Write a protein that binds this ligand. Sequence first.
Ligand SMILES: [Zn+2]
Ligand SMILES: [Zn+2]
Lengths: 366, 389
Amino acid sequence: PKLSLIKVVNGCRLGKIQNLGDCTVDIPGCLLYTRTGSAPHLTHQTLRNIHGVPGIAQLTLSSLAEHHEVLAEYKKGVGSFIGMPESLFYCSLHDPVTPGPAGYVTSKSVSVWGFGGRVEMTVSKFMAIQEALQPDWFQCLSDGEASCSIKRARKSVDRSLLFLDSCLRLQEESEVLQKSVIIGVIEGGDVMEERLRSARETAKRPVGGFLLDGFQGVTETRLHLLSSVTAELPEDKPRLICGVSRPDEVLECIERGVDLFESFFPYQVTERGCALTFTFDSFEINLKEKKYQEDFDPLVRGCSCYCCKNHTRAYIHHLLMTNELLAGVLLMMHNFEHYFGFFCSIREALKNDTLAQLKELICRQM
Amino acid sequence: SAPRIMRLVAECSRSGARAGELRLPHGTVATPVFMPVGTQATMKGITTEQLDSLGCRICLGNTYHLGLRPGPELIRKAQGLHGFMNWPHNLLTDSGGFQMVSLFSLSEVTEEGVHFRSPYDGEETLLSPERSVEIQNALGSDIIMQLDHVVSVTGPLVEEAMHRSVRWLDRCIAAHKHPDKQNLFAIIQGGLNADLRTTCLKEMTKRDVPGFAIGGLSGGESKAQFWKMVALSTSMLPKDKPRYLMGVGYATDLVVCVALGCDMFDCVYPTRTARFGSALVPTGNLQLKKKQYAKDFSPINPECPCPTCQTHSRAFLHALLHSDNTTALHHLTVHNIAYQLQLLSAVRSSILEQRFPDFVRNFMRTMYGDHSLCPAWAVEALASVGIML
Ligand SMILES: [Zn+2]
Ligand SMILES: [Zn+2]
C-alpha cells in the first residue's frame, strides 16, 4: 500500500495509490457513491460498463450499522455480503446526503441513523461493527459536529484523538482488521488553532490517510482552513474530504492538496430528475420540462454511456412522468459516467498543465 | 375564531396522546379514529348495516373514483353521497386531484389546477381548487379536503409544490361558502424536508380552517424520517383542532402515531390484504390460504366481535378461499375492518382510563415479543414521548 506521486503541479497532486494487493486508485479522483450497499439504482452488471468507474467504493456506516447482527453471522465481510467480494471499500461514518440529526456526540459515543432506529456506537461497539464489515479502509470514529465557540471546537479535536488512539489499540488485537486501514479524521471546526492541532496530532498516529471533516458548504474562510491543514499533513498519504462533490468545489480543494472526493453530486442530480450536461473537454438539464417530450436526442450528444447511446430525452421524460425506476437507472448511468469523465479530464489536465483552463471552463457554466 | 369541531376528553398523562370527539353534522366521532373507504367495503359486499354494526361512524369517499362513477351530477340529484349510497354517518372526501389517480392520467400541474389526460390523445380536463370545492359541495361530505399540489421527489419541486398548496388552500377557503355544513381541512406538505415542512406548518396554521391533515408521508421514505416528520407536524399543529395523518394504517404505525399526537387515519392496504387471504390479528396476520388452516376449526380470533369470527372457522374460510373466493373476500374484509376499528377503540379506551403506556407495552409485546424484537424506529418514537418498553 503506497501513494506514489506522478507529478505535483501548482499545489495539485497527480498520482496513484498502489498495492491495494493488485489494485490501484488514481488521484485526484473520486470514490463510487453507494447507499445501503448499492450504487443507487444500478446493478453490479450495469456499473461494470460505466466508463471511468473509480477503483474504490464508499460505504456509509449510517446505512449499514443497523445490519450488524446479520453481517456478524455472515463472517466474510460486507463486500462479500453485497455480492462484490473483489471490490475495494472505504467505509465513512456518515452519509453526505442524509446525515441525520445533530447533537448526539459525546466523549463516549457517536450515533448514526439508517432506515430505522438510532445506532449508538461507543469505541468498542464501533470496532465490533467494523469487524463485521471488514472494509479495506474505514474512517475512524470522530466528532465532526463542532460547526453543526472555541470550547466546542477544542472538544472535537480531543474527542477525536481519544477515539483514534482507542480504535488503534483495538485494531492491534483484531485478527480480521489486520488487513484494514484506519483513516484519521481532522477536526477543529472553524477555529484555526484547533484545526492545526488536529492536523499535527493526527499525523503523529500511524493512519493510512486523512479525512478532512467539517468543510461541507465551501466558504473562502474554510478553503483557507483547508490549505492550512493540508500543509501540516505528510505528502505520502492520501487526503480524503467528505461532503464536497460539486465540480467547482472539487477543483478548489484539489488546488489545496485534497486527493479523493465523494461522488454523491451526480446522485443528487439524478434524484431531482436532472442530467449533467456540462462540458469538460447548460450545466444540467431537467428532463421533466415539457420541451423534452418530443426531443429525440440523447442526454449528451457524443456520450458513450448506455443511456445516451441507446435512449432519448423523450423516453426519459416519459419515464419520469410515470415514476418508473428505469428513469433513475438511465439518469444515474449517465450522471456517473459524466462525473467520472470529468475526473478523468482533471487528471489529463494535470498531465498537460491545463487545469487552470479546465477550471474556467467549469466556472463558465455555473 | 370559528367554532371548534373537536373537544379533548382525555390526554395521556405520560405521552400526551389524545382522546377526543368530533362534532360533525352526521354525528359525533370518537378519536383517535381509523376511517375505512366506503366503496372498498361495498366492492366486497359490505352493507350499511354491517359497517354500522362494526362501530364505523365515518368513512372515506375517493373523489376521483366517485367523480367517474356515478359522477357528481348524479350524486347531486340523489341529494348527496349520504343519500345516494344510503350512509347515515359521516363522510370525508379528498380534493379529487391525486388520491388513487394514476400518473398515466395526469398531465403536469399548473397554477390553475390539476390536469387530467384522456385516452388516445384526447382533450384534457382541468380540476381547479374552486371546482374541487364545488364537487365536494355536491357530494355533501362532512369533511372536505383542500386541493394540494402532491408530489411523490427532491429538488425545488418540493418547495414549489408546498407553496402552491398554501395558495390553493386560500382558494379553497374562498370558494367554500358553507363552513357551517362541511368542514374544510388543510393538508401540510413539505416532504421530508424539516425546513419546508416547518414553513408549511407555520403558514397553513395562519388560516382558520377547522382541521389539519398531514400529507406526503404515507410511503417512500425511511421510517426514521417518517416518524420525525409526524412529530414535527404534531408539535406545530393546533392542539384544539384535529390532526389527520393521511395514508397511514398498519397497526404498529397507528399506535405509534397516536402516541405522537395524531387523531385520524386512513389506509387502503391493511384491509386490502384480505384480497390475498390474510386476516389481521394481534400477532400480525394469519395467511389463511396456508395448508395449516385446512383443519383449524377455531375462528380467526375468538375475541373478535365481527360477524366472521362469530360464525366461521379458519378451516371454512380456507376452503372458501380456494373454492368460493368472492365469498371468502367478503368475510375477510369484514374481519379486517373490524380489527382496525377494534384496535383504535382499545387505544382510545386506554387513554380514557390513563393506561395508554401499558396498552402500548402490551400491544408491542403481543405483536413482536421482547423489546429487542420491536422495530427500532418504533422504540425510538415511543421513547420520544416517554413510553419505554
Ligand atoms: Zn450519457
Ligand atoms: Zn373477526
